[PDB]
Design a protein around this ligand. Sequence first.
Ligand SMILES: NC(=O)c1ccc[n+]([C@@H]2O[C@H](COP(=O)([O-])OP(=O)(O)OC[C@H]3O[C@@H](n4cnc5c(N)ncnc54)[C@H](OP(=O)(O)O)[C@@H]3O)[C@@H](O)[C@H]2O)c1
Ligand SMILES: O=C(O)Cc1ccccc1-c1ccc(-c2cccc([N+](=O)[O-])c2)o1
Length: 316
Amino acid sequence: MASRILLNNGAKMPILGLGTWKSPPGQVTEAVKVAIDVGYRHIDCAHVYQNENEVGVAIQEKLREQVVKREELFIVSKLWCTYHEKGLVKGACQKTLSDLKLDYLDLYLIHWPTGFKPGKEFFPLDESGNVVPSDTNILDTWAAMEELVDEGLVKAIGISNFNHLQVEMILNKPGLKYKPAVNQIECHPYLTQEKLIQYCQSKGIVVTAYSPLGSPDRPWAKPEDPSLLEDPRIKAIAAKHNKTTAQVLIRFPMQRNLVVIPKSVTPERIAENFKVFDFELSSQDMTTLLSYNRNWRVCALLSCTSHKDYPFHEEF
Ligand SMILES: NC(=O)c1ccc[n+]([C@@H]2O[C@H](COP(=O)([O-])OP(=O)(O)OC[C@H]3O[C@@H](n4cnc5c(N)ncnc54)[C@H](OP(=O)(O)O)[C@@H]3O)[C@@H](O)[C@H]2O)c1
Ligand SMILES: O=C(O)Cc1ccccc1-c1ccc(-c2cccc([N+](=O)[O-])c2)o1
C-alpha cells in the first residue's frame, strides 16, 4: 500500500487525510497540529465548515516550525453552492486561501452540483423551506474552476457529490480544458457505491470516500440509526486483525484504490486512524464488507430535493 495515488494532473495525493467538518473551532487547530505531527499530510477543508481560519493556524504553525514543507502537504477545499456564479468563483477561492493562509490549494472541488442564490446564507430558502436555486450552468462553473488552475490559485480541480450523469456532463463539456481530478462522495460499507466508483475509475477520476465511519456525529443522527462502528460483523473482522473497527473502516476504501478522509478531533483517535498501513484485508474480507451495502445514505438534505441538479434521484 503506497501512501499516495497519482492524479490525472500529474500530482500525487495522500490516500489518507483528516476530515474537518464539525471539528469545533476551539479544537481543530490542535487536531490538525496533532495530525501533522503523527504523519497526516492531507487535510480536507471547506468554506462551509466555518473553521478554515483555525485549520489554517495549525497548517501555518507546522510550516513555520518546519515540521513539514508546503510541497509535502495536500490541502483540499471546496466551492460552496452559493458561489457557483462564474464571477464569484475566484473570490470564493481567494477567501479560502486567505483563511487557510496559503498561496495555493492542492485540490479545489465543486462541493455539490446544486447551485444556490448568492448571499450571506449558506442555504437561502423560500418561505416554504425550499432552497433557492441559481440559474448558473455547471459547465460555466467548471470553466471558472479551470481559470483557477490557469491563474495559479489551485493545482487541481474536481467535483463532489456528482452522480455519474453529472460527471459525464463535465467530461463531455465542449472545449473541456482540465478533467476533474477527483470526485469526493459518501462511501462506507452501508453505501458501497460500486457503480459510481467503477464509472469514475474507468475515466481516470480518483474517488475520495467521505463519512467513512458513517458520520455518527452528523447533526441529524437518530438514536436508532445503523452504526458502522458498532456493527458486530465489522468488529469481528477487526478483532481477527488485532485492529479497531475504525481502522478496518479506513483500510477498506484504501484497498479499493480510494482516498479516505476520516474526521476526528480526539488526539488518540487521530493517531489510531493513521495506523492503517501495517495490515491487509483479504479479498474475502473486502467482499464481505462490500456485502453489507444497504444503500443507506447519511449525507443529503430535504431542502434540496427539488433542485434540478439534486444528485441522488438517479440510481448512481
Ligand atoms: N464533500 C462533502 O459533501 C462531504 C460531506 C461529508 C463529509 N465530508 C468530509 O469527510 C470528512 C469525514 O466525514 P464525517 O465528518 O461526516 O464523518 P466520519 O469521518 O465518518 O466520522 C466522524 C465521527 O467519527 C468519530 N471517530 C473518528 N475516529 C474514530 C475512532 N477511531 N473511533 C471512534 N470514533 C471515531 C469522530 O469523533 P471525534 O471527532 O469526537 O473523535 C466523529 O464523531 C468530513 O469531516 C469532511 O471533511 C465531505
Ligand atoms: O457538505 C458537506 O460537506 C457537509 C455540510 C457542512 C456544512 C453545511 C452543510 C453540509 C451539507 C450536508 C449535505 C449538504 C447538501 C448541500 C447541497 C445539496 C445537498 N443535496 O442533498 O442535494 C446536500 O450540505
